[PDB]
Amino acid sequence: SKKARVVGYLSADSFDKITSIEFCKLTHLNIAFANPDKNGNLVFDGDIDAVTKYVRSVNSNIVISISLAGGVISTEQAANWSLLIDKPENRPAFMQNISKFVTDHNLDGVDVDLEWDAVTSGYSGFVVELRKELTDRKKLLTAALPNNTRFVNINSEALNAFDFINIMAYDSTGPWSPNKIEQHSSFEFAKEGVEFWKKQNVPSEKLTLGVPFYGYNFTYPEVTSSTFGEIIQAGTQFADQDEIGKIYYNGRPTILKKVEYASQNTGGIMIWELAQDSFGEYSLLEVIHKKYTDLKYKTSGMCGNAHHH
């Protein structure tokens, strides 16, 4: 059947924007991010129960996961990760803590967003053990992975354990490469990422194509980020292009292209990050929703979608 996922990341710092986010257009919501403290306990700064209560009242079928780690972790958090998963004898208590967090907060799964250097030697054993805990409790286990790099510390059993993966098909350049002044999330980069993970023997259905609701401003040597919402505030005439001088993002036509491509080549679309959108008429989440509906794909089945599915 014509169906697709629409997986949205929501940062803790975005919680006061949830009344503007159309959760009826998502199938999955990832709350970002929880991280371990010095004691092996998962810390989340924010009223996650209030958020999930509200979200489930908007879309009672949404699948809500806690996302772990994330792109921005402190040296202390990264060291706690390494201490907890790189020594197999430290994993047991941490794993129980993760499972109890999922139960205590009535969540549907866990998303692993350990990135780059935080993908340490214990990653695969951690994933395999956590996978069993969650499978046995009928919960999801997913991961966000880089566009076109296979980390040595992600073995095949771990990679295949995930219910699906979220390809981070963006950040091809950024503030860490301030002289590569160009698009950070081109259509070609997205296609490269999908093809790459298929070459890793991940089936199409288990791929989710990430798209960015932000861009980078290379005007000065210090590169800054701009949300799509901020770009539209600068002018609605910018909604349908990808570049303003040295600012590079994804406008509506390019998001639309990526949705058309995803419909034929992956199991869905992933969004970083929901509260960066332009809420209302120019919304990129709306572009995704409308395009999947026009293609006759079921996503949420709400708010106009999947009428004749």
Residue numbers in the entry: 36 to 344
Paper lines:
No culturable Bacteroidete has yet conclusively been shown to deconstruct cellulose via the actions of a PUL7, but we recently identified and characterized a chitin utilization locus (ChiUL) from the aerobic soil bacterium Flavobacterium johnsoniae. The F. johnsoniae ChiUL consists of 11 genes: two SusC/D-like pairs for oligosaccharide capture and transport, an inner membrane transporter, a two-component sensor/regulator pair, and four enzymes. Here we present the crystal structures of the FjChiB chitinase and the FjGH20 chitobiase, as well as a small-angle X-ray scattering (SAXS) envelope of the novel FjChiA_M domain.
